[PDB]
Write a protein that binds this DNA or RNA. Sequence first.
RNA 1: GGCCAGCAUCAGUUUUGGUGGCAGGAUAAAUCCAUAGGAAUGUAGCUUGCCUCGGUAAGUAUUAUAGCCUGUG
RNA 2: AGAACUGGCGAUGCGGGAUGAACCGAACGUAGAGUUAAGGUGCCGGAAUACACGCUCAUCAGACACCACAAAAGGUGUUAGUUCAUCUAGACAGCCGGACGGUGGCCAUGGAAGUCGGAAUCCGCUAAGGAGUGUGUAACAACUCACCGGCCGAAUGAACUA
RNA 3: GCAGUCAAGCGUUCAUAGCGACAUUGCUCGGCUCUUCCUAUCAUACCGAAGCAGAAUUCGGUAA
RNA 4: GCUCCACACAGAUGGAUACGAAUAAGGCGUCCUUGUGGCGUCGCUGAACCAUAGCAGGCUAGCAACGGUGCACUUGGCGGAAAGGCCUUGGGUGCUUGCUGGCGAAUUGCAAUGCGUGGGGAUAAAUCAUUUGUAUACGACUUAGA
Lengths: 170, 36, 183, 190, 197, 136
Amino acid sequence: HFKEYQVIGRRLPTESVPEPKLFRMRIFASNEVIAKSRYWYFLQKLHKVKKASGEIVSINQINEAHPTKVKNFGVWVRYDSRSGTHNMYKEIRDVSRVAAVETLYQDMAARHRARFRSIHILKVAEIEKTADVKRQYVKQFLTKDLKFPLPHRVQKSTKTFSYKRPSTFY
Amino acid sequence: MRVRKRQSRRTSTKLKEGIKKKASAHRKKEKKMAKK
Amino acid sequence: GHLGFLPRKRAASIRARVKAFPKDDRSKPVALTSFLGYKAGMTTIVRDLDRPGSKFHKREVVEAVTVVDTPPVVVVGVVGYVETPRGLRSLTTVWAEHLSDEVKRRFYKNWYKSKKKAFTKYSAKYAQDGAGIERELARIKKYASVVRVLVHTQIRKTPLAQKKAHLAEIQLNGGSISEKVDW
Amino acid sequence: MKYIQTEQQIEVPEGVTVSIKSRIVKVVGPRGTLTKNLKHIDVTFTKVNNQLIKVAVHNGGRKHVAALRTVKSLVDNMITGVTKGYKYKMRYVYAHFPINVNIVEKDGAKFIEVRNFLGDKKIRNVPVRDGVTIEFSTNVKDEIVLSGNSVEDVSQNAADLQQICRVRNKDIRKFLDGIYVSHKGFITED
Amino acid sequence: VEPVVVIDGKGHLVGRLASVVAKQLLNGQKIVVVRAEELNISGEFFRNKLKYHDFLRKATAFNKTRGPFHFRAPSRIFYKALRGMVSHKTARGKAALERLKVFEGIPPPYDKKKRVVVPQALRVLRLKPGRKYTTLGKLSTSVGWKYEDVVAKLEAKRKVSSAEYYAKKRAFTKKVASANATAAESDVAKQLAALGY
Amino acid sequence: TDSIVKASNWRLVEVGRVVLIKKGQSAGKLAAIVEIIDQKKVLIDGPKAGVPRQAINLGQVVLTPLTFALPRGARTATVSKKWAAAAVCEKWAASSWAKKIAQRERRAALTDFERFQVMVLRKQKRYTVKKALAKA
RNA sequence: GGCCAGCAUCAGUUUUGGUGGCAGGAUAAAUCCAUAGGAAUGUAGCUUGCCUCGGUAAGUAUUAUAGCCUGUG
RNA sequence: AGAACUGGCGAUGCGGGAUGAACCGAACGUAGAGUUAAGGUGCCGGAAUACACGCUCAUCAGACACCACAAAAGGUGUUAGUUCAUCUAGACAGCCGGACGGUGGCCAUGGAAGUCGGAAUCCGCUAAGGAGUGUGUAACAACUCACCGGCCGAAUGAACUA
RNA sequence: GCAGUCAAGCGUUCAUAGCGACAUUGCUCGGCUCUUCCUAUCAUACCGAAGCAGAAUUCGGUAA
RNA sequence: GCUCCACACAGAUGGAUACGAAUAAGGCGUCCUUGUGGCGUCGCUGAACCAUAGCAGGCUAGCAACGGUGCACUUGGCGGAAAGGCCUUGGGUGCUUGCUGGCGAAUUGCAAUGCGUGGGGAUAAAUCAUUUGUAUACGACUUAGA
């Protein structure tokens, strides 16, 4: 389970160059230590720096603004593959950004066999207005007065032997 | 019909370990070929 | 050789038992399906051949035939078999109350030493209005999908110095099991 | 993409009525009755207004939706099978030997004897399905008519009648001889 | 809980069925699967048939009277599925198997007796809708077994007698359920309610 | 001449469908489906029952046959408004299902002496019922 | 005074629950409440089409006799 | 294949990898208790037929392992993508119609009118129609599509990657 | 097989750091006897294509 | 096998509580156009249901109702898949905790669960030996004989 982290760094203040530009980014991780490590990994790719040349100035947990309102998120993803890296845009309906990126990571592993080290989360944005929601499987749930059943339900047994011949009604 | 012979899925220890030697051989080639 | 005729071993008895029977039609009249005798003989026959399409149509053919001696088979019982998921299963056999000296001989290996006390209590079991015999015959007619006839050979009318007749089981291919058990 | 709801519309005319429990379909109407088991298919039927029927697949992949449309087709085929009926007209052609097609009834089987096909002593016996009726076309030479209610009965019998008359170990181009479905249609034309 | 435990091996899944029977034994519980034929597997027919068939192809080369005894009967067909699931060469195994009993169809005194099921091996629950399974009755027949019909016949008749029994039952039940309802609101009654019963 | 096609009637998952949570911190409390997220997850809140507003799996929950009129995306106060106005709590208590849950809970917290009362009362009820039978 | 035990209060190592006090973060984020704007998978209303009597449909209508989102406190 | 340095085995039991010279774990007196490593938790077999999101149906699936060999591909299996395209001036599919005159263009030759073949392969007229996409006749005709246009009303198309 | 002609892409950007599949163009120890098994089948069985008039045949499929 | 004498003695602990079929469907109740019929209701676990209070269950006094149950006699009908059991007709017979009395419990001391032999007799049969030769290395088999 994830957590969003604002992690900043400004390549250690030396002589003749005081107070550098403080490079800020939002990092999804499980804890603070992984977030820090991922941040250094991203910095080495965005420009030519190193872990020893800089310093983590502030690490902060970004709590979700309204964890009760169901949102329509659109996530820009890129990831290393069997071949070269490539962009991807998946649309996710969820309550929070942490939970939406969670469902993405499990889906990316499920459909593309990409682990945690491959995936570069670019930008997670709310899609404010519907009918601008591009993906059809998300637009599937944005219809008026959606009433759908769950036919054929399993009844979870606590014992080995039953005396009914179970009824999978709903 | 006369059901024909089925291939085994038992990998013998000679095969399995020989697979590892052939794999590591492919590595040593790939590291050399990367330099050219 | 032929791998079907294996194991190439000595049989259980001289009287080999019949392995399969002719099917069954449940509208045909009641008639026996197998018979037994005593094979002994071989001889030559000539006959004119009315086999059209042959090289010997309206010609004469000599050929070898065999003479099995077959004295009139005598019925001494009936067996009823239920159809099971395990095959067939004999549930009741019924006998003839008064059987020959030949078959009471078949029930012993040493005939002369015995008191010849074979079916004494079975014949005494009959000794009334029936009551139990008709009960077992109801038992056969009610259940028992196939019905086979217990017979034996007339050994004395054959020149054989054996004196000891053979029991057998012969099914009936006459329909309605009622007509089988009542035959 | 796993559809949430997919539905088709089976249109019921005036003369016919559709009675369905589980997945067994009545089509009771003018010409007769037709029944079809569909418990292999896994759908849900909905009668909206006694004149329109809604088949339904919830949570179905492309394979399950591919089954969803074929139910609509089969139930509709039963409807047009009762209202209009089916009439398959088979014309049989021959070069030299006159093909002799007759209907015989041995043991109540209602067979079709196909005699003298390409000068052949074999007498071809085709079984007639329960619900297909055979008459010969008057005033038109060399024509056999197959008519009934079910599409399967009429069309499979038409297929049987032309697969017994295979031109064996010979030309296709030279030997025209055989029986052929000239016209697939309905009994009542409108 | 009981001395014996009769399972209705219908619409079940040989595997998950056997595996839930297997251990059950080793733990000393007596068990008697029935209606074996009606049992189920998983996968388009042919599939299984092709499977078994290859098994039916393994015989002691030099003397096939010695090698893998290939059993047809749905029972045996499912006793081998439970056997190789229990150290059956040891003593603790033989002793286990010995308290197991597979029956194709339902004979006495099992008939007139309650018969359970095993949810965790129920095809309806386990399997996903619209996915070919392969009954056991078929496979068996199309490979050697030759008593499919009989049982069938002897099974239909075994139900009838069953039905009637029930009918009689539903009735006597109604009668008791109606009398009870009429015993409601009677101090005693009233009270029980407060104590759930 | 009717077209009788019946029926396969389910409990549909919808906005305003009241649910009962099987497992978790809440476990056995009622909540209402406020908004549907996807095929597996819904959004639930039962303020009167005490369950906080949360995204839950439909594996964690079981649908109950009751419904009411709730507008989609309703905050806690709106849920409590329509909850009380429709009186779904009393409609829950009226059902056989709530009576069965309360039945098991009543039998659980029974004292041994109270269990002995059940022993005696069932003996008395047995007597009068057996007299009620063997008459018809 | 020998063999085996039970309980209690103890001490060492450990396993497994119940419950209280705090402290940290956006001094949690939320919810809830008060206020200001918006669009909707558009709400009551209003207009209109053609019919099984009033249902639906195609516009308006910023919530009015549902609600929602965003912003500030 | 040659050096260097490094572990392991060798003088080393034990847990695991079903099995075992070099593979994973592992500070061997005799015992008791607790906790773990590697490996595991359907049953054999001690331990969850756990939970959660997905993907796969295999005519002998797969459980396998620097993802190494047959390995570049084929497939109207299925799920995700990317890049270009069309689309309520009406997308794809579907039938209904037009699909033209110079012109039977020149050589060819018995007969070749777009469609046996040899070379350009042009003009006009339109909404659009190629010196013609295949079937066809000896030669024509006739049909077909590519190109439009008429009802039909929302998505669809191509090339790649996983 | 060698050399060239194309040439999906990849080359650290990328066709002018280079590799490059199918095609294509250049001339040129042996043997006697038995048992069992495999199919990569010569015949027997059934099919598909073939100027297959018939007969005969050629190639191909299932098949031990 | 019958009789005569002599002796010997792999894990029960309230009840395995019986429709069948379907699962994208069913069960039950009711009603009618008697049907793949209308209407109501049920599941979402057997967490059930039936049995269950007495010196390990004694002895007695009753009250209420024609019930429940045990035991053995008994009228049949039913059950062949391993039927070996299932219902039913009745008479007797104890007991009943349906409700209320009447007595006994100690000292157990504060836990240690509390159906074969070895000989007789009587009568069925088998083997050996004999004979057989449809059998045969020897066994075995087929025969024959108070």
